[PDB]
Amino acid sequence: TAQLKSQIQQYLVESNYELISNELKARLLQEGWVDKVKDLTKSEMNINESTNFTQILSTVEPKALEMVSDSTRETVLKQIREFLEEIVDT
Amino acid sequence: AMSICPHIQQVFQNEKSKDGVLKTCNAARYILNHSVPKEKFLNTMKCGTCHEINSGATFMCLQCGFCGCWNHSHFLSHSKQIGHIFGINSNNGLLFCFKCEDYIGNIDLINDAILAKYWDDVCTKTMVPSMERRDGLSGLINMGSTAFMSSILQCLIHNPYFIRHSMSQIHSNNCKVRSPDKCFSCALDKIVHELYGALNTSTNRQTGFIYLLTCAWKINQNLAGYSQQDAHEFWQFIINQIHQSYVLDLPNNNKQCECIVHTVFEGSLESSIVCPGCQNNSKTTIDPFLDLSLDIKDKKKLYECLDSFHKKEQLKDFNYHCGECNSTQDAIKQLGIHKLPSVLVLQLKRFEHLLNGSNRKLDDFIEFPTYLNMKNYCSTKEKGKVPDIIYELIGIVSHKGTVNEGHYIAFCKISGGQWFKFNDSMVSSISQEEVLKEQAYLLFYTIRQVN
Amino acid sequence: TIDSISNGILNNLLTTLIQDIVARETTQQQLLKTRYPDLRSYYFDPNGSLDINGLQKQQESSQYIHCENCGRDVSANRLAAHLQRCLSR
Amino acid sequence: MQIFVKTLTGKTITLEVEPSDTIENVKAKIQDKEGIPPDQQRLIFAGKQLEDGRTLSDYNIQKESTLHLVLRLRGG
Amino acid sequence: DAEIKGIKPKVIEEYSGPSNDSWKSLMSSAKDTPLQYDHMNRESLKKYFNPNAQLIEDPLDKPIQYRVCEKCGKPLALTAIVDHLENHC
Ligand SMILES: [Zn+2]
Ligand SMILES: [Zn+2]
Ligand SMILES: [Zn+2]
Ligand SMILES: [Zn+2]
Ligand SMILES: [Zn+2]
Ligand SMILES: [Zn+2]
Ligand SMILES: [Zn+2]
Ligand SMILES: [Zn+2]
C-alpha cells in the first residue's frame, strides 16, 4: 500500500529535516539563485503588467526549477539519499 | 483597474461572519508565532488526504480543521467537495480565494487584522504612507562637512530594529525631557517623521537633522559637522549617547546594559590562552564588542581578512609561566566569537603608518560577499562542530580621498532586493553588482539564518 | 524506488519554497499597485546621473535654509559655520 | 598588571599597567613602542573610545583585557 | 537504487485514513508557548547568541508597515498606534 510512504515521512518528521531544509536554503541563497528568482519575478510582473499569482506562477516555476545549480541539486539529493539508506529494508 | 475578491467582500457584508474570520486569522497567526517546528510539520504541513508532509504548500482550512496539499489538489478537493473557498498557506499565513485563483495581498484590513477591533478608529486617526515618503527616501544636503555623519545615518535609517524602535514611540512614550533639541532620540523620531510622514501641515524635510546637529554641537562641536572626522568614531560616540539616553529614561548587579544597542549590536569575543606544550588549558577572557575592525594588507577578500583576524598569535612580550608543563613560555593568543550580534558592523582598516610619522590610505579592493558565514569563527563546540551562521549584507559605507581628507558615501538595500546610493541630497538606483565592485570601508550585516 | 522517493522529496522542498516566495512577491506587488494606482518605479539611470525621481543634483549654493536660531537665513552649505558663530552664546 | 593592544596590522603588544593609570599614560606607552603620537591614536574598548583624563578603572578595564588600536579616516 | 520491502519494525516499535484531528488543538499549546523563529535554531541561539538579543527574521521582506497620524503627523508602527492615540498624539 501507499500509506507506507506517508508513514516513512512521518518518521522523517519525528527525527534532521531542519538540517536538510536549512542546508538547501543556504546553498540556494549563497549562489544567488534566490535573488535571480526575485529579479525574474519583478521582470515578469512588469512584462505582463499583472500581480495575479496563478498566471505568474505558471511561467515562473519551470524556469526556476531549471535554474537550480547542478552542484546544489546533486549534493542535496545525495544527502537525502544518505539519510534514506538508514531506515529502509531492501 | 485592479479588482478585489468579491467573495471576501460578501463575507464582510456581515459583521459577525467577518469577526469570526478575523478572529480565526489572528488565532492562526498567534499559533504560527507560538508553535515548535515538529508540531508545525505534523499538523500544518501534513496533507489530510494522502498524509504526506510538504506535498507542495499545505493549506489550513478557514472553515474547518482539514489540511490539504497542492500536488494532489487535496485542498482543491476540500474546496470542490465542501464548498470552502478560503484557505491559509501554512508558510506565510496569507489567505487564498480559490475562485479568484489569487492571493489577497492588497486589503489593508487583512494585513493588519489584529487591530480589527479598533479598525474604524485606526481609519479615522491615521492614513497610509504617502508614495513619496513610503520608503522614507530623501536626500540630506551637506551642511558643511557632514558626509561622515549622513553616510552613517542612512544605514541607520534603513535598519529594521531602529525603525521598529523609533516608530514604536518608545523614546517618545518614555522621554522625561521630551525635547528634540536636547534628546537625540526625539530628534531621530522627528527625522523618521519627516522622511516617512508629514509635519503639520523649496526646503523640505531637514528639521530633525538640524536638531541632531544642534545637540552634537552642544556635546562636542568638533564632531558636530564643521570639521572632517572619523565615521567609526562617530558610530561609537552616537551609539554610546543613545545608550546613555536609554539609561536616562529609566526609572531605575546588572553589568550588561539592557539598551537597544546592547540587544542588537553586542557580542562577545573569547580569548583563549593555552600552553604550547600541554595544549589543553585554557585561560579564557570574554570581551564585549559592538563591531569588528579588520586588517586588509596582502589580502583580496573579506574572508581572508576575517581569517587573519581570527588567526592565532604568539605573544613575544607577555610574561608567562605555565603551571602544567612547569616552564616559562610564550603564550598563544586567539580571538574567536563567544556571542554574535543581531547586526554585525565591520570596519576595514584602510590605512597604514610609516616610519616618517606619516600615514597612507590603502585603496586595495577587498572582496566582500552578499552572504557571510561565521561558522569557522565560533570558539565553542557542541557535543564536535559549530553550525552554519549566515548574515545578509544590508549596508555599505565607502570613502574616497586620503587618510586625512575625503568623502563618505552610503549604499543601502531595500525590499525587492534593489540597491540605492545615498550621496548627500542624491538618492539613486544602483545595481547590486556595482555596489559589490565598490571599495568598502564599513559593512552592515543583519542575521539571516542560524543552524 | 529510493531514487524516486528522493526525487519526490527534493521536488516537495523546492515547490514549497517556490510557492512561498512567489506568493510573497505577488502579494507585495499587488498591495503596492492597489495602494498607489499612479505608482511609478524609482528611476534607474544607466548613466549614473539621475536620482530616484529622475533628477540631477541640485545647485548649491543656490538653496538656502532659514536658521530658526537668531532669525537669520543662511545658505545651507555654509550653515555649520553659522552655527559655530551662532550657538557660541 | 599586563594588558594587551591589537594594532593596525593585527599584531598584539603587551603593556604593564595599573587600573589607575590614565589614558594619556597608556597612549604614551604606545607611542614609546610604535612611535605614533597620542593625538594620532584611537584606543577602543567595549565599543567606546577611551578618553584622556580618565583611568582604566573608570572603564572597568582589568588584567589581560585587550584594547584595539585604530587611526582616523577624515571625511567631510 | 534498490527495492524497498517494508518499514523496519523497531521504529514502529518505539515511535509509531483521513485524520480527525484539528489544527485549533494547538491553541492550548500556543497559549503557553513563547515567540518562535523559523530558520534560527533556538538552542544554537542560546549557546552562541545573547539571551536578550532582539531578533527580526527576514527583515527586508516588505517595505516598512506603518501609518501616519492625521493630527500630529507621526509615522507609527502598527503595535504602537493605539497608545499613541491614547496619550501621545
Ligand atoms: Zn495529497
Ligand atoms: Zn473546511
Ligand atoms: Zn475571489
Ligand atoms: Zn527626548
Ligand atoms: Zn544596553
Ligand atoms: Zn606545557
Ligand atoms: Zn543661527
Ligand atoms: Zn499622532
Coordinates of N, CA, C and O in Angstrom, one line a residue, chain B residues 234-337:
Chain B
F234 N 32.4 58.3 15.1 CA 31.1 58.9 15.2 C 30.1 57.8 15.5 O 29.1 58.0 16.3
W235 N 30.2 56.6 14.9 CA 29.4 55.5 15.3 C 29.4 55.1 16.7 O 28.3 55.0 17.4
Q236 N 30.6 55.0 17.3 CA 30.7 54.6 18.7 C 30.2 55.7 19.6 O 29.5 55.4 20.6
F237 N 30.6 56.9 19.3 CA 30.1 58.1 20.1 C 28.5 58.2 20.1 O 28.0 58.3 21.2
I238 N 27.9 58.1 18.9 CA 26.5 58.2 18.8 C 25.7 57.1 19.5 O 24.7 57.3 20.1
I239 N 26.2 55.8 19.3 CA 25.5 54.7 19.9 C 25.7 54.8 21.4 O 24.8 54.4 22.1
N240 N 26.9 55.2 21.8 CA 27.0 55.4 23.3 C 26.1 56.5 23.8 O 25.5 56.3 24.9
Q241 N 25.9 57.6 23.1 CA 25.0 58.7 23.5 C 23.5 58.2 23.6 O 22.7 58.6 24.4
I242 N 23.2 57.3 22.6 CA 21.8 56.8 22.5 C 21.6 55.9 23.7 O 20.5 55.9 24.3
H243 N 22.6 55.1 24.0 CA 22.6 54.2 25.1 C 22.4 55.0 26.4 O 21.6 54.7 27.3
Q244 N 23.2 56.1 26.5 CA 23.1 57.0 27.7 C 21.7 57.5 27.8 O 21.2 57.7 28.9
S245 N 21.0 57.8 26.7 CA 19.7 58.3 26.7 C 18.7 57.3 27.2 O 17.7 57.5 27.9
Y246 N 19.0 56.0 26.8 CA 18.2 54.9 27.3 C 18.3 54.8 28.8 O 17.3 54.6 29.5
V247 N 19.5 54.9 29.3 CA 19.7 54.8 30.7 C 19.0 55.9 31.4 O 18.5 55.8 32.5
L248 N 19.1 57.1 30.7 CA 18.4 58.3 31.3 C 16.9 58.1 31.4 O 16.4 58.6 32.4
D249 N 16.3 57.5 30.5 CA 14.8 57.4 30.5 C 14.3 56.3 31.5 O 13.1 56.2 31.7
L250 N 15.3 55.5 32.0 CA 15.0 54.5 33.0 C 14.4 55.2 34.3 O 14.9 56.2 34.7
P251 N 13.5 54.5 35.0 CA 13.1 54.9 36.3 C 14.1 54.4 37.4 O 13.9 54.8 38.6
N252 N 15.1 53.7 37.0 CA 16.0 53.0 37.9 C 17.4 52.8 37.4 O 18.1 51.9 37.6
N253 N 24.2 45.2 40.1 CA 24.4 43.8 39.8 C 24.1 43.4 38.3 O 24.1 42.3 38.0
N254 N 23.9 44.5 37.5 CA 23.5 44.2 36.1 C 24.5 44.7 35.1 O 24.3 45.8 34.5
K255 N 25.6 44.0 34.9 CA 26.8 44.5 34.3 C 26.5 44.9 32.9 O 26.7 46.0 32.4
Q256 N 25.8 43.9 32.2 CA 25.3 44.1 30.9 C 24.2 45.1 30.8 O 23.2 45.1 31.5
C257 N 24.4 46.1 29.9 CA 23.3 47.1 29.7 C 22.2 46.5 28.9 O 22.5 45.6 28.0
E258 N 21.0 46.8 29.2 CA 19.8 46.3 28.6 C 19.2 47.1 27.4 O 18.1 46.9 27.0
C259 N 20.0 48.1 27.0 CA 19.5 49.0 25.9 C 19.5 48.4 24.5 O 19.9 47.3 24.3
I260 N 18.9 49.1 23.6 CA 18.7 48.7 22.2 C 20.0 48.4 21.5 O 20.1 47.4 20.7
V261 N 21.0 49.1 21.8 CA 22.4 48.9 21.2 C 22.9 47.5 21.7 O 23.4 46.8 20.9
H262 N 22.7 47.3 23.0 CA 23.3 46.1 23.6 C 22.4 44.8 23.4 O 22.9 43.7 23.6
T263 N 21.2 45.0 22.9 CA 20.4 43.8 22.5 C 20.5 43.6 21.0 O 19.9 42.6 20.5
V264 N 21.2 44.5 20.2 CA 21.3 44.3 18.8 C 22.7 44.1 18.4 O 23.1 43.2 17.6
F265 N 23.6 45.0 18.9 CA 25.0 45.1 18.4 C 26.0 44.4 19.3 O 27.2 44.3 18.9
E266 N 25.6 44.0 20.5 CA 26.6 43.5 21.4 C 26.8 42.0 21.3 O 25.9 41.2 21.3
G267 N 28.1 41.6 21.0 CA 28.5 40.3 21.1 C 29.7 40.1 22.1 O 29.9 41.0 22.9
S268 N 30.3 39.0 22.1 CA 31.5 38.7 22.9 C 32.5 37.9 22.2 O 32.2 36.9 21.5
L269 N 33.8 38.3 22.4 CA 34.9 37.5 21.9 C 35.4 36.6 23.0 O 35.3 36.9 24.2
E270 N 35.8 35.4 22.6 CA 36.5 34.5 23.5 C 38.0 34.5 23.2 O 38.4 34.2 22.1
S271 N 38.8 34.9 24.2 CA 40.3 34.9 24.1 C 40.8 33.7 24.9 O 40.7 33.7 26.2
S272 N 41.4 32.8 24.3 CA 42.0 31.6 25.0 C 43.5 31.7 25.1 O 44.2 32.2 24.1
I273 N 44.0 31.3 26.2 CA 45.4 31.3 26.5 C 45.8 29.8 26.8 O 45.3 29.3 27.8
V274 N 46.7 29.3 26.0 CA 46.9 27.8 26.0 C 48.4 27.6 26.0 O 49.2 28.3 25.3
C275 N 48.9 26.6 26.7 CA 50.3 26.2 26.8 C 50.7 25.5 25.5 O 50.0 24.5 25.0
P276 N 51.8 25.9 24.9 CA 52.1 25.3 23.6 C 52.6 23.9 23.7 O 52.5 23.1 22.8
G277 N 53.0 23.5 24.9 CA 53.3 22.1 25.3 C 52.2 21.2 25.6 O 51.9 20.2 24.9
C278 N 51.4 21.6 26.6 CA 50.3 20.9 27.1 C 49.1 20.9 26.1 O 48.3 19.9 26.0
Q279 N 48.9 22.1 25.5 CA 47.8 22.3 24.5 C 46.4 21.8 25.0 O 45.7 21.2 24.3
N280 N 46.2 22.2 26.3 CA 44.9 21.7 27.0 C 44.2 22.9 27.6 O 43.4 23.6 26.9
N281 N 44.5 23.2 28.8 CA 44.2 24.5 29.4 C 42.7 24.8 29.4 O 41.9 23.9 29.5
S282 N 42.2 26.0 29.2 CA 42.8 27.3 28.9 C 42.3 28.5 29.7 O 41.3 28.4 30.4
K283 N 43.1 29.6 29.6 CA 42.7 30.8 30.3 C 41.8 31.6 29.4 O 42.3 32.2 28.4
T284 N 40.5 31.7 29.7 CA 39.6 32.3 28.8 C 39.1 33.7 29.3 O 38.6 33.8 30.5
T285 N 39.1 34.7 28.4 CA 38.7 36.0 28.7 C 37.6 36.4 27.8 O 37.7 36.2 26.6
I286 N 36.5 36.9 28.3 CA 35.3 37.3 27.5 C 35.2 38.8 27.3 O 35.1 39.5 28.3
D287 N 35.3 39.3 26.1 CA 35.3 40.7 25.8 C 34.0 41.1 25.0 O 33.8 40.6 23.9
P288 N 33.2 42.1 25.5 CA 32.1 42.5 24.6 C 32.6 43.2 23.4 O 33.7 43.8 23.4
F289 N 31.8 43.2 22.3 CA 32.1 44.0 21.2 C 30.8 44.6 20.5 O 29.8 43.9 20.6
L290 N 30.9 45.8 19.9 CA 29.8 46.3 19.2 C 30.1 46.3 17.7 O 29.2 46.5 16.8
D291 N 31.4 46.1 17.3 CA 31.8 46.0 15.9 C 33.1 45.3 15.8 O 33.8 45.1 16.8
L292 N 33.5 45.0 14.5 CA 34.9 44.4 14.3 C 35.7 45.2 13.3 O 35.3 45.5 12.3
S293 N 37.0 45.4 13.7 CA 38.0 46.1 12.9 C 39.0 45.1 12.3 O 39.6 44.3 13.0
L294 N 39.1 45.1 10.9 CA 39.9 44.1 10.2 C 41.1 44.6 9.5 O 41.0 45.6 8.8
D295 N 42.2 43.9 9.6 CA 43.4 44.2 8.8 C 43.2 43.7 7.4 O 42.5 42.7 7.2
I296 N 43.7 44.4 6.4 CA 43.5 44.1 5.0 C 44.7 43.9 4.1 O 44.6 43.5 3.0
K297 N 45.9 44.2 4.6 CA 47.1 44.1 3.8 C 47.4 42.7 3.3 O 47.2 41.7 4.0
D298 N 47.8 42.7 2.0 CA 48.2 41.4 1.3 C 47.0 40.5 1.1 O 47.2 39.3 0.9
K299 N 45.8 41.1 1.2 CA 44.6 40.3 1.1 C 43.7 40.9 0.1 O 43.8 42.1 -0.3
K300 N 42.7 40.1 -0.4 CA 41.8 40.5 -1.5 C 40.4 40.2 -1.2 O 39.5 40.7 -1.9
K301 N 40.1 39.5 -0.1 CA 38.8 39.0 0.2 C 38.5 39.2 1.7 O 39.3 39.1 2.5
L302 N 37.2 39.6 2.0 CA 36.8 39.7 3.4 C 37.0 38.5 4.2 O 37.4 38.6 5.4
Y303 N 36.8 37.3 3.7 CA 37.0 36.1 4.4 C 38.5 35.9 4.7 O 38.8 35.3 5.8
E304 N 39.4 36.3 3.8 CA 40.8 36.3 4.1 C 41.1 37.2 5.3 O 42.0 36.9 6.2
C305 N 40.5 38.4 5.4 CA 40.7 39.3 6.4 C 40.2 38.8 7.8 O 40.8 39.1 8.8
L306 N 39.0 38.2 7.7 CA 38.5 37.6 8.9 C 39.3 36.4 9.4 O 39.5 36.2 10.6
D307 N 39.8 35.6 8.4 CA 40.8 34.5 8.8 C 42.0 35.1 9.5 O 42.4 34.5 10.5
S308 N 42.5 36.2 8.9 CA 43.7 36.8 9.6 C 43.4 37.3 11.0 O 44.1 37.1 11.9
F309 N 42.2 37.9 11.1 CA 41.7 38.4 12.3 C 41.5 37.3 13.4 O 41.9 37.5 14.5
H310 N 41.1 36.1 12.9 CA 40.8 35.0 13.8 C 42.0 34.1 14.0 O 42.0 33.2 14.8
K311 N 43.1 34.5 13.3 CA 44.3 33.7 13.3 C 45.0 33.8 14.7 O 45.0 34.8 15.3
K312 N 45.5 32.6 15.1 CA 46.3 32.6 16.4 C 47.6 33.4 16.3 O 48.2 33.5 15.3
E313 N 47.9 34.0 17.5 CA 49.1 34.8 17.6 C 49.9 34.3 18.8 O 49.3 34.0 19.8
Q314 N 51.2 34.3 18.6 CA 52.1 34.0 19.7 C 52.7 35.3 20.3 O 53.4 36.1 19.6
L315 N 52.4 35.6 21.6 CA 52.9 36.9 22.1 C 54.4 36.7 22.5 O 54.8 35.7 23.1
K316 N 55.2 37.7 22.1 CA 56.6 37.7 22.4 C 56.9 38.7 23.5 O 58.1 38.9 23.9
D317 N 56.0 39.5 24.0 CA 56.2 40.5 25.0 C 55.4 40.3 26.3 O 55.2 41.2 27.1
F318 N 54.8 39.1 26.4 CA 54.0 38.8 27.6 C 54.7 37.9 28.5 O 55.2 36.8 28.1
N319 N 54.8 38.3 29.8 CA 55.5 37.4 30.7 C 54.5 36.3 31.2 O 53.5 36.5 31.8
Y320 N 55.0 35.0 30.9 CA 54.1 33.9 31.1 C 54.8 32.6 31.6 O 55.8 32.2 31.0
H321 N 54.4 32.0 32.7 CA 54.9 30.8 33.2 C 53.8 29.7 33.3 O 52.9 29.9 34.0
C322 N 54.0 28.6 32.6 CA 52.9 27.6 32.6 C 53.1 26.7 33.9 O 54.2 26.3 34.2
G323 N 52.0 26.5 34.6 CA 52.0 25.6 35.7 C 51.8 24.1 35.4 O 52.1 23.2 36.2
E324 N 51.2 23.8 34.2 CA 51.0 22.4 33.8 C 52.3 21.8 33.2 O 52.5 20.6 33.4
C325 N 53.1 22.5 32.5 CA 54.4 21.9 32.0 C 55.6 22.5 32.8 O 56.7 22.1 32.5
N326 N 55.2 23.3 33.8 CA 56.2 23.8 34.7 C 57.4 24.5 34.0 O 58.6 24.2 34.3
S327 N 57.2 25.5 33.2 CA 58.2 26.2 32.5 C 57.8 27.6 32.0 O 56.6 27.8 31.8
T328 N 58.7 28.5 31.7 CA 58.5 29.8 31.2 C 58.1 29.5 29.7 O 58.8 28.8 29.0
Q329 N 57.0 30.2 29.2 CA 56.6 30.0 27.8 C 56.1 31.3 27.2 O 55.7 32.2 27.9
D330 N 56.1 31.3 25.9 CA 55.5 32.4 25.1 C 54.0 31.9 24.8 O 53.8 31.0 24.0
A331 N 53.1 32.5 25.4 CA 51.7 32.1 25.3 C 51.1 32.3 23.9 O 51.5 33.1 23.2
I332 N 50.2 31.4 23.6 CA 49.4 31.5 22.3 C 48.0 32.2 22.6 O 47.2 31.8 23.4
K333 N 47.8 33.3 21.8 CA 46.5 34.0 21.9 C 45.7 33.8 20.7 O 46.2 33.7 19.5
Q334 N 44.4 33.7 20.8 CA 43.4 33.6 19.7 C 42.1 34.3 20.0 O 41.6 34.2 21.1
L335 N 41.6 35.0 19.0 CA 40.3 35.6 19.2 C 39.3 34.7 18.4 O 39.5 34.4 17.2
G336 N 38.2 34.4 19.1 CA 37.0 33.8 18.4 C 35.8 34.4 18.9 O 35.8 35.2 19.8
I337 N 34.6 34.0 18.3 CA 33.4 34.6 18.8 C 32.7 33.8 19.9 O 32.4 32.6 19.7

